[model samples]
Target: SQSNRELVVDFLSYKLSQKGYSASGMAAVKQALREAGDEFELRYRRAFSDLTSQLHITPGTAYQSFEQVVNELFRDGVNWGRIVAFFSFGGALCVESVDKKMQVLVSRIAAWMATYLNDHLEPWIQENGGWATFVELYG
Candidate 1:
């Protein structure tokens, strides 16, 4: 359901935006990842109660998902808004990997964001809100 997706986003938009600096866009996305420890419990604790276990987002799987989103973005002509969400997905995955002490995957995924943002999306991010803007509202 498209409607469900819309409703969820609309609610989230309201939740984050009411604060002024704006919780929508990359700001909200980064906040979600930075707070991924709390989030993993809320959303995934039941299925993976054993904190010692490796999260499914291993290095192998993280690259696959990261590549999938990048490929989709190139094919779709690079929508900036969705681009935030796409990379945030990997960011969340990285957080999960860290929670499990999988430092290797964490570095790998951070490199993805660093490379993707620096090489391809840097200028556009500046025009849109840049990392500082996201932190102002979120950090």
Candidate 2:
């Protein structure tokens, strides 16, 4: 069990690294794990490992699943049009200031968002199957 758990921890670490988490980001994950205790980290690690392996998909797919989950959760009687409009305006303004450093930061932020979404939303996806199932259920 310990070996299996270690494998899962290592897998999650590897996946995070593949997703472009910097050293600092990995440190945050390790800190979170420490705060959450070994059992919580073990469960998270195992679930992430199992989901990625079972779906035979990349982190991007997992991130898309998360986006679908978020949309499903907010679709019912929610003003998605307004939300999108607001984000569009914000994005337009933000894109105007793009320099090399800002571009790099933006890219990193996007990657981090993807990874965080995948981590948080994988449970719901697993329970409901793919994004299609999520949409059908909540759409």
Candidate 3:
């Protein structure tokens, strides 16, 4: 379970860490993310936009807004595609935040995602078989 949380955090952090890099042992993770990112764009783009419009994250409200919106995304259930969407959503938010010159939000979003994954997504991830399963299926 602990290592599960680490993988999830590392996957999310890949975006926040840098757009063009990965360290050791992240190849499968990066591959999985690329597939998931494509899946997000192919099927979940409009759904993601709806969620974005609801975010309304300004300077002061990011913390609460992220928690609320992310909660909504998982309100139904946890599945591979939805988990992919979650990472995509966080990446989009980070990109937008950087575009608006609020670079601070990037790590904050990563932190929120790490927290959310540990608290909410970990159980489901653990139940299923963690990132190794994801890589096996999607990598």
Which of the numbered candidates is closest to the native, going by highest lDDT? Answer: 3
Model 1 bad stretches (over 4 Å): 1-65, 99-101, 127-139
lDDT of 1: 0.48
Candidates in descending lDDT order? 3, 1, 2
Each candidate's TM vs. the true structure?
0.41, 0.27, 0.78
- Relative to the true structure, candidate 3 reaches a TM of 0.78
RMSD of 2: 16.5
Two-way lDDT contest, 1 vs 3, winner: 3
lDDT of 3 by residue, 1-139 (tens): 4554455456655564555433235667667776677677677677543677778555776566787888877778999888888887877777667767776676677777778777788889879997789888888
Query: Could you tell me which 10 consecutive residues in candidate 2 have the lowest summed lDDT?
Result: 85-94
- Give the per-residue lDDT digits (tens) of candidate 1, residues 1-139: 2322332343333433432323334445445434442344356445522422333566566554566556554465554444445444444554556557675765566555556655556676578686456445434
| Poorly placed runs, candidate 2 (over 4 Å) | 1-101, 135-139
